[PDB]
Amino acid sequence: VSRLTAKRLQWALVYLPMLVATVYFLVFSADRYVSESVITVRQTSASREDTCYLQTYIHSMGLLQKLDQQLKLREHFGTPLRDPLFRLWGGTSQEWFLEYYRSRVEVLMDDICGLLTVRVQGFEPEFAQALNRAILEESERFVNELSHRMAREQKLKSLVVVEPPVLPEIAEYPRRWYNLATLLVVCCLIYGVVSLVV
Amino acid sequence: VYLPMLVATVYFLVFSADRYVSESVITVRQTSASREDTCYLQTYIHSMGLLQKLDQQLKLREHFGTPLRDPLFRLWGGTSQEWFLEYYRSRVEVLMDDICGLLTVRVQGFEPEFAQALNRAILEESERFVNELSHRMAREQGKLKSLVVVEPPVLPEIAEYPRRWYNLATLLVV
Amino acid sequence: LVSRLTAKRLQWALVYLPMLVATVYFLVFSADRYVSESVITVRQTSASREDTCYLQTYIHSMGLLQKLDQQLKLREHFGTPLRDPLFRLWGGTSQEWFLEYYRSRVEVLMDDICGLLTVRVQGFEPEFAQALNRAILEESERFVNELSHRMAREQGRKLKSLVVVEPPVLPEIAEYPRRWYNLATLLVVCCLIYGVVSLVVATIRDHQD
Amino acid sequence: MKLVSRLTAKRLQWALVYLPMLVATVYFLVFSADRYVSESVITVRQTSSREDTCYLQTYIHSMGLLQKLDQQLKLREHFGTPLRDPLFRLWGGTSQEWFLEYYRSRVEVLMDDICGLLTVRVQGFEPEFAQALNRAILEESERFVNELSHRMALKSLVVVEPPVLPEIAEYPRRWYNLATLLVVCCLIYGVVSLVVATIRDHQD
Amino acid sequence: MKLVSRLTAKRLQWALVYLPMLVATVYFLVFSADRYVSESVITVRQTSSREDTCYLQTYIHSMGLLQKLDQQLKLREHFGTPLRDPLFRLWGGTSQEWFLEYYRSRVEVLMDDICGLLTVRVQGFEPEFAQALNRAILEESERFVNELSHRMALKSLVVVEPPVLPEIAEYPRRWYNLATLLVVCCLIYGVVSLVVATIRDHQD
Amino acid sequence: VSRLTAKRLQWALVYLPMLVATVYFLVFSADRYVSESVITVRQTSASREDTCYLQTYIHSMGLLQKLDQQLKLREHFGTPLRDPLFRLWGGTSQEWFLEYYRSRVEVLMDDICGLLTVRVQGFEPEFAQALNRAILEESERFVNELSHRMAREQKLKSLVVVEPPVLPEIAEYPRRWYNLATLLVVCCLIYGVVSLVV
Amino acid sequence: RSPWQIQQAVLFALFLRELKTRLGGRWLGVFWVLLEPVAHIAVMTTLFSLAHRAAMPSIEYPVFLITGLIPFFMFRGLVTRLMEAIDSNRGLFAYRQVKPIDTVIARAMLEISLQSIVYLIALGTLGWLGFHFLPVRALELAGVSAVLIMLGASLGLFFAVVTNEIPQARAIVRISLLPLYFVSGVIFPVHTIPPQYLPLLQLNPVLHLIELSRASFFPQYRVLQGINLAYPAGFALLSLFLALMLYRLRRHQLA
């Protein structure tokens, strides 16, 4: 009972989420260009320690303050007004700003080669490339100043850039078709599970 | 079932007090074995002498009792020293990352400024403790170990730990 | 007899009598035991694991107990609570039993990854517990220094030191006598035992025909 | 219901076996293009390590090296020459990301842990171009290693096997792929036919 | 089957429970002798490791040390004093091997791998003699270590716990052994009674 | 199954071996005194290598030649004429002599402490002690000569004696009662297994 | 007659019946029961002799294995032979004196007797060969053995009650008994295990009982953290109470 007919249950379950997901993706959702860089830390004459230091420091809060003071991150990230999900709403909390920044910037560590891959998302390729360059420069300054504080208690290490920040041509995200197909798959599975219970 | 949900909702949405969290990330390194001093510090943060120093520095006993409508997370008046130590251990969270050797300190508090001040006091007392612990062994025969701050204490803007909706959903699971 | 047992007799013999005995002992005749906790380590000043092991063995030794008894009169102190017969040190006992009692009162735990030795000293007064912990720490440091000195003399200034991470803390309230937790867990165990016994006797009585 | 009876298993085996093999055979024996492969085996040592070899492996598949090679040898123009092949031809006006993915598909880098020797296999539509691209990759890799050593403040590239000039194409393997597709299509047709028979029996 | 019929139940429990417990109780509460135990904890360190302590452990249970101690403290005469005890008394006129086994039974040497500290527990029929024997063992062990170091071409014995003077006997534990024997006898009697009932039923 | 009766078959299978073994052990078998020594090798002002060298060398053949030339081992080991099993028959092969010597002299190695225990059996308490002392002296001379040849190719190591060869008072072997009880248990088990097959 | 001698007579009768049917032919099953542990000791010694030699320089492999194995054989028998005690003797519940739990306790008693006889014989053999054979704390060993026996009997009765109509349940628990043989530390000592897997193994009462029995057997045997007797004792008591309650509820449903 409870209006368990196929047409009404399907209309409540399958088509409406899929249709809205498509309209949001193909009409409303904005795109995010990705700039990639690959780096590592070497001594100018223990390295994994400073690599982990940098991995923690990139996702920190003081670096976010420096980046916002430099490139006006909070002003740029709120420009797409037709994407209520991936845009940074004005007046949000500092903690939510940190979560959004951590979502937009991905840091991957490969331990066997000791390499750090930084992928920075943006709404403009130039902004993403500039933000990646600023992150790299601030990381080098941070490790240099960390080495310098022990001397000031009374240029030591350098940042090796295997691949510099690239300038993207097209947007790697949001991958509308792949997400829509995945949503179709999970929705069909959920409908099958629900229709099992009769 | 309905009565526990009713009382939990009216406690969380009306009576529960906000608790702001300040985060710091540190590590101790010899100024040219650091794991030993890091573990000494990790033990020292939750010690009793450190809590005493913090008590006559910032008066945590008065601050933690300022709320009156949140008896669950309130430091009641006239409580014992051991229960006060347990409360302080519950409020200050220390985490260790061994593959990087980094110590994360999260400080709770009903006011963000007091939480940040508490974290800064903890950091400076830890540095002084490391220096004095080395210095006593130094002059038993008769400044070398500095604590670097990967992430300095932050000033929170909104409460984090009173996750009302998440705890309500978790109770709905049970 | 077995066939003459009733439910109320089983309840009184199993559940009620131990409940009353435990409640009377814990709420009236139990003596408070304050605990003072300290955390220490030993390192050279100018191989620390071997010295931590030496200290762990030496704390529970008998010569240290002899010095502590001569200094602080532990035997006189521990016999003071007359109302608690289980946890008091009865006068005129043996030296071996005195050593066992001292080893029971003083707890020593070791963190090998951190290499930290924590000592929890029990006493019937907080000041005495703190004083005993301080005396134990001082004697441990003196023993380490004496071992280094006699090694150096047999070969032919303090060369070894004991670092205290957390000094002995003066307790405010008793910790180890846990009346309510023990009462609750014993009540649960007693109810389970009574249920099992009643089920077994019902199964036995099932064979009446 | 009606749809399951519509196959009659004859159109079913035609649409699951005959059409895919016919299309694949036509593409492989008519439109497929040769792809000559040149192989080199190198490693890095100090002229007086493993991490430097890993850095080289990461650097070979990077975008700066691809830009340098496209400026030097004009890879983008060369890879679009086989207009007969629609699949393995770099179409005109593609994006930077598509060019990077195509270049990463053509150039294959392999490393073994026991020996620590890095092998590079470079594809092309001409043996001379494949050998030239492999030599350029090696030269730029050694230049990158030397520049990294210089800017750090004395390393050399050990070329165990220099790039070779291939004689015939090896990768567009037609008969092996045709046999693999035949096996896959036969298994898929058998499974589908069994399932459709089961549902045809169960429906009524 | 007639023999097991005479065994019945009363005779079985009288011959399997009553007699062993009566004999053990009489021996423990009448004829058993006190054995005071002195404990020491030592290790060897160079003045300036584990192997030397292991050599000491082997040396303590040796025959040369036993001969030295028998010449010094007259262990053989002392261990024969408790004529009331027939079991734990060294009978006169025994062999060298029996004396060595008895001495190895009285003196117990224990090792832990984590700490590397060697503990020696020496039994006796007098606390003073047990403490004296422990002190003599320690002195001869340190002398042996020093002599080995000298004849090799500078070592000392660290005494964490010096030998103590016991106040009461601890090893002739009467009530614990009586309870253990009661449990063992009860289990043995139950098993034997069940088996004898089974074979009595099966035989006829 | 012709003589499968319990009486005759149990007589033949069980009791005759027990009787002959009992009379051999309690009438004919001779006793062997055991002398024990505990040693190790130390470097004078890699040790396990020379310990293994000594373990192999004690059970070697040239050492047997030296010991036979010194103490007349083959003459002594043939003196009990009423023990046909454990005596060394005259005129035997050199290989059988080596096997007999290896059976009489037992070498045990403890790797954790690196100690070598040598137990020498004999038909006389003085002979076993003398043979053990000769073995120890020859082992020390062997390691010294091994170092000396290496030095000569153009006193270096010493033998540490934890326990010297003791002088036995009674014979540790052949353990007549233990062997008889073990044989009784084995024979009873074999009889039960055989009588199972009926 | 009193309602107690009836139980004794029924238990004796069922014990005799089950001993008769268990020993096939002229007692051929005792040879099988004797050949399981010697075969096990042979294969595991041949495999991990050097492994135990590198593990700890205080215990030889045969005695460690035998005191870790015979109690586990006790427990496995008390689990496996007890679920089949109800369906096999289903036809006997028509004589006005036989109840379903009588066969269960008879099987438990026979398993106790057989495995205790095997334990005593094997310990005597090991002592005869020259190995260590005397426990240092016999009373604690007896207490641990009694706790393990009670836990095994309780689990057997609970499974017999629960899976009366589900033979496939008996099959899957017979399958899962085998991993319990490897996760109980029977073969190899448990302190040579990474600590991250330590708490997950702290939930197995059989491991606690095996470790405590080995501690009460061997001298100066080190026991790691969280091997208290309270947890397995409470587990056994709760399981026994649950099994008795379930049997009392589903009492008249057994034909």
UniProtKB/TrEMBL annotation, chains D, E:
Transmembrane segments: 11-30, 175-199
InterPro entries: Bact_polysacc_biosynth/exp (IPR050445)
Keyword presence, Transmembrane helix: yes
GO molecular function list: protein tyrosine kinase activity
GO cellular component: plasma membrane
Assigned keywords, A-Z: Coiled coil, Membrane, Transmembrane, Transmembrane helix
Listed PANTHER family: FERRIC ENTEROBACTIN TRANSPORT PROTEIN FEPE, TYROSINE-PROTEIN KINASE
Protein name listed in UniProt: Capsular biosynthesis protein
Organism name: Caldimonas thermodepolymerans
Lineage, top ranks: Bacteria, Pseudomonadati, Pseudomonadota, Betaproteobacteria, Burkholderiales
From TrEMBL, chain G:
GO cellular component: ATP-binding cassette (ABC) transporter complex
Organism field: Caldimonas thermodepolymerans
Sequence intervals crossing the membrane: 27-51, 63-83, 104-129, 141-163, 175-193, 229-247
One of the GO BP terms on file: lipopolysaccharide transport
Protein name: Transport permease protein
Record-linked InterPro entries: ABC2_TM, ABC2_TM_bact-type, ABC_2_transport
Localization terms from the record: Cell inner membrane
Membrane topology summary: Multi-pass membrane protein
Pfam families: ABC2_membrane
Entry's family note: Belongs to the ABC-2 integral membrane protein family.
Keywords from the UniProt entry: Cell inner membrane, Cell membrane, Membrane, Transmembrane, Transmembrane helix, Transport
GO molecular function: ABC-type transporter activity
Keyword Cell inner membrane: yes
Keyword Plastid: no
Residues of the ABC transmembrane type-2 domain: 28-250
